[model samples]
Target: MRVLILALGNELMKDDGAGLKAGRILAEKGYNVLEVGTDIFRLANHYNGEERIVIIDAILSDKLKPGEVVHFSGEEIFEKLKAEIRSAHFMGAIDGLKLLMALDERLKRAEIHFIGIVAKEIDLGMELSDEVKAGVQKAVEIAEKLAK
Candidate 1:
């Protein structure tokens, strides 16, 4: 089965780059990972009817500690998260993906995985916080398993 890993976030904004960092490691491991940055819609241009997708990003949450990883698959993504939780992008990753999936039959049926790292900080910097940095590793591991 074909799998696509959509990595989202702005690297310049501290821990927001966790997804991109994890994407680099996954790509090096020979996975089909796309560094979509802060644009969730970019997946449309790259879509080729993959059977599964894994989305990775950094999230801000008071309830979860920094570096904590959250995994939501299929409908759990819609049930467990609100629009703001994945608000790093313009329309938010979930909303944008919902729109895309609604338009594409392949995406609507594909098994989708969301891997979020609770961010310690989202500021004007390129480096991730230590906690988020470690969280990136965890994200990569989860993504690898999901993609497989």
Candidate 2:
């Protein structure tokens, strides 16, 4: 089974770059991982024919604390936060998947999952906050399981 792991966010922003860090971990494990720091729009080209695609990114969930992790399939994720998380560049995690599905019906049938790590801060900086650094470690653990 072919699987693709994508990390999405801006490294310049503190916790916003969680996806990029997670992607690095997955790559070290020899998985087909791609770290797309702050360029979520380019994701479609990477889809290829992979049977499974997993996305790891920083999420803004009011209920979760910094470094918290949440896992959900694409459909489930869209159902939960399709409306609230809509943006032009990032498109939030859920909205991006939904948009992909809309653009291509086959995308809706693809095995897509989203692993979101609650972010503590997304300020303009080149370093990740302590909370987000810990969260990246936790996210790596989860990615290892998924990659396996």
TM-scores for all candidates?
Answer: 0.90, 0.80
Best by lDDT: 1
Residue pairs clashing in model 1 are: none
Worst 10 residues of 1 by lDDT: 83-92
CA lDDT scores, all candidates in order: 0.84, 0.72
Candidate 1 regions exceeding 4 Å error are 83-86
lDDT of 2 by residue, 1-148 (tens): 6777878887787778887877887788788887766555566886676777787888787666888777777567666556433212245444665677687765667787777777777889878778878888888887777665
| Model 2, runs deviating above 4 Å | 82-107
Measured with C-alpha atoms, the lDDT of residue 17 in candidate 2 is 80
lDDT, residue 90, candidate 2: 41
Model 1 per-residue lDDT tens digits across residues 84-146? 355455236667878998999999999988888899889899988898888999999898888
**C-alpha-based local distance difference test score of model 1:** 0.84
Q: What number of backbone clashes does candidate 1 have, counting pairs of residues 3 or more apart or in separate chains?
A: 0
The candidate maximizing TM-score is: 1
